[PDB]
Design a protein around this ligand. Structure first.
Ligand SMILES: CC(C)OP(=O)(OC(C)C)c1ccccc1CS
Ligand SMILES: [Zn+2]
Length: 227
């Protein structure tokens, strides 16, 4: 299918969004409603994700997290706002989105001319620090710059699942916005937290991995240009 929504553990599901360049996002089915982690590429892909959600749960979509300011993590925002879901980010992500959205949409369309010229849609719930959702069962945090300056991690402690959005993946991927020397330092700050991790969900390529995806990407970026 163009998009799939599949249980990884308990209430934690992975979205494989095969539109444009494959991106993987998360959904958490909680007691009061649904939390989406990663808005998906466009308002249309967001609507496609919502369709899949409605086949699983009648509970409201409460909030959607933009794990960075880029089009693959925030492009769906217009749709999520339109259904009354909160759009959530750090302040840093929101500030970078305000200043740089036009630039990232242009960059996206250079690679994907078919991609729409999306107007800016900013988060309406902005956090100054780390934050949690779903009674502490979805835990968002900043550990430094990597693929972008602002990208955050989201950890699901009950299921021992870590999502890093665009940070963790199988191939080097986009380095155009990356802090190549800081990237492994961020990955080491992450590992030093000693979070119990059974599963890492990569944000591109095939999603399902163990904790070693962190080490895999770390080794790749330490050999990359500008390392
Ligand atoms: C700004 C966007 C999100 O990144 P991107 O230019 O998207 C291309 C146009 C598909 C891109 C390029 C190469 C590898 C991965 C990605 C996604 S992080
Ligand atoms: Zn990405």
């Amino acid at each position: 299918a163009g998009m799939s929504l599949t249980q990884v553990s308990g209430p934690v599901y992975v979205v494989e969004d095969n539109y444009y360049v494959q991106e993987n996002s998360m959904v958490y089915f909680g007691a009061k409603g649904v939390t989406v982690v990663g808005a998906t590429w466009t308002p249309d892909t967001a609507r496609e994700l919502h369709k899949l959600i409605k086949r699983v749960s009648r509970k409201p979509v409460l909030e959607v997290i933009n794990t960075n300011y880029h089009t693959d993590r925030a492009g769906g925002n217009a749709y999520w706002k339109s259904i009354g879901a909160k759009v959530v980010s750090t302040r840093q992500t929101r500030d970078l989105m305000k200043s740089d959205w036009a630039e990232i949409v242009a960059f996206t369309r250079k690679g994907l001319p078919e991609y729409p010229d999306l107007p800016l849609v900013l988060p309406n719930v902005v956090h100054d620090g780390d934050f949690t959702l779903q009674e502490g069962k979805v835990r968002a945090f900043y550990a430094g710059p990597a693929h972008t300056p602002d990208g955050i991690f989201v950890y699901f402690p009950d299921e021992q699942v870590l999502y890093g959005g665009c940070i963790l993946k199988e191939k080097l991927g986009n380095l155009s916005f990356a802090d190549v020397k800081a990237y492994p330092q961020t990955l080491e700050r992450l590992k030093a937290m000693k979070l119990p991790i059974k599963t890492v969900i990569g944000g591109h390529d095939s999603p399902l991995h163990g904790p070693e995806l962190i080490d895999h990407y770390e080794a790749l970026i330490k050999a990359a240009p500008q390392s």
